[PDB]
């Protein structure tokens, strides 16, 4: 009569590494590293992302004519740019503090596009029909949907001074532009004053802009330049524009809401009818595992990104079916 | 292993023991068979469950983390942001891989120890009423029916009850 003591063996082929030995076949184990995604852009906690289509942030904010106009009000969980964004700034020039603006938009959860300065009503005694071929649409020369190219009317550019009081109860993103002709002849033909200036003030913002005329290499067949500026007008505060030339005036502005967990990602994937708690530029992750090796860029509640190819914890025994 | 049982003086595992990590095989007149030890298996399961869960718990939820952009005159800040992201990534990859290796080693050792401890528990229960025939087995110096076997398995083996007969067979 005999009794023996022994231990479990099974057919498992799971292998784990240890410090003394690599590649040990074990009976039971758990994988801690998520490596699978669904290859789709999804809703994040039930909220769809903001897709900019053919535009980047600049093109969308300035109102580039080539992109399909969005609904007046939007709410999102994250912002998606496409890698090949052909439509951005269409009239050549510098976008001052553009990166900072993107970083601001990274915590915005909603916008309302509203007419801050109505076209036929805000700039009397000035022309508002200025267009350009650098910002073409359907072949014809056009211009930014959110801005207005003010020029001389009937041989004169009278000093304008207009203002907006923010009664939206939220921050209002106001954008404008400053035009820089390549010569003084064009400066006179457009704004009738060689010593022009633009002034923009709020309670906490205070800037003055002066035309700087010089011949420049052609960009998008333009020797002139256009510098783009922006400011966030606090609730209740007032913004004042004052100019006698060169002002690319605001026409539409954005009432902004703040949120958490958002961000801006560059992605190729397509939006699908699906929901997730974790979104990467390559696809969504549905997992409770502590690590992932899919992508460093994550939105929502995601596992920690690591470079590892394998993170497998043994739970069972050294497997010896022999 | 560290305690010398698994892949040690007990060469291999039992494909035929399907209801636990550690256990017994017996052979007597009534027949033979496998029966796992549920107390030790349950203890080991509790331990390793708590280990796995501990590893998962120590890693917090990774909330939103996306890249930033910098203009052509902000190269230093761009490289500093990059140095930060790469540093943190190095450190976490290192931490994860190392923790998994260490804990794997300790887990195999833990199993080895459980098997050895079970063996020793049985040995100390049986004393000289049986002999160690190697490979983790005991040969009784007396008849051990199903009831006797079960008394051994659930830790209530009655040594004096078989002491005489064993002494006689041992001679």
């Amino acid at each position: 009569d005999t009794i023996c003591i022994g231990y479990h063996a099974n057919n498992s082929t799971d292998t784990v590494d240890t410090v003394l030995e690599k590649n040990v076949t074990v009976t039971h184990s758990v994988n801690l590293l998520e490596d699978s995604h669904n290859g789709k852009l999804c809703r994040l906690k039930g909220i769809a992302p903001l897709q900019l289509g053919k535009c980047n942030i600049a093109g969308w904010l300035l109102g580039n004519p080539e992109c399909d106009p969005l609904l007046p009000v939007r709410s999102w969980s994250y912002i998606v740019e496409t890698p090949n964004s052909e439509n951005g700034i269409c009239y050549p020039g510098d976008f001052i503090d553009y990166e900072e603006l993107r970083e601001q938009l990274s915590s915005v959860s909603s916008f309302e596009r509203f007419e801050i300065f109505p076209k036929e009503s805000s700039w009397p005694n000035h022309n508002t029909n200025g267009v350009t071929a650098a910002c073409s649409h359907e072949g014809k020369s056009s211009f930014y949907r959110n801005l207005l190219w003010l020029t001389e009317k009937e041989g004169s550019y009278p000093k304008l001074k207009n203002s907006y009081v923010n009664k939206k109860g939220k921050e209002v993103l106001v954008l404008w532009g400053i035009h820089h002709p390549p010569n003084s002849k064009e400066q006179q033909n457009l704004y009738q004053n060689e010593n022009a200036y633009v002034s923009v003030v709020t309670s906490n913002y205070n800037r003055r802009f002066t035309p700087e005329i010089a011949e420049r290499p052609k960009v998008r067949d333009q020797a002139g330049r256009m510098n783009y500026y922006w400011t966030l007008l606090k609730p209740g505060d007032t913004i004042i524009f004052e100019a006698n030339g060169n002002l690319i005036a605001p026409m539409y502005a954005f009432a902004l809401s703040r949120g958490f967990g958002s961000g801006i990602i560059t992605s190729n994937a397509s939006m699908h009818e699906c929901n997730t708690k974790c979104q990467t530029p390559l696809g969504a992750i549905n997992s409770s595992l502590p690590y992932q090796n899919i992508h460093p860029v994550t939105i929502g509640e995601c596992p920690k990104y690591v470079r590892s190819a394998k993170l497998r914890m043994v739970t069972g025994l050294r497997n010896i079916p022999s | 292993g560290l305690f010398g049982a698994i892949a040690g003086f007990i060469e291999g595992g039992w494909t035929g023991m399907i209801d636990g990590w550690y256990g017994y095989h017996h052979q007597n007149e009534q027949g033979s068979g496998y029966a796992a030890d549920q107390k030790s298996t349950q203890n080991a399961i509790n331990g390793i469950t708590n280990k796995v869960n501990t590893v998962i718990e120590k890693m917090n939820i990774q909330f939103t983390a996306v890249g930033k952009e910098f203009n052509k005159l902000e190269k230093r800040m761009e490289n500093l942001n990059k140095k930060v992201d790469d540093g943190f990534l190095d450190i976490w990859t290192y931490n994860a891989e190392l923790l998994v290796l260490l804990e794997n080693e300790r887990t195999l050792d833990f199993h080895d120890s459980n098997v050895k401890n079970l063996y020793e528990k049985v040995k100390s229960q049986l004393k000289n009423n049986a002999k160690e025939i190697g490979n983790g087995c005991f040969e009784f110096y007396h008849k051990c029916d199903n009831e006797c076997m079960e008394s051994v398995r659930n830790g209530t083996y009655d040594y004096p009850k078989y002491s005489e007969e064993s002494k006689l067979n041992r001679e």
């Binding site: 039971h28 758990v30 739970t315 069972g316 | 209801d19 349950q42 796995v52």
Partner: peptide
């Protein structure tokens, strides 16, 4: 989490 390896386990 649980390691449901045997049905008699307590989990």
């Amino acid at each position: 989490x649980a390691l449901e390896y045997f049905e008699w386990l307590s989990x």
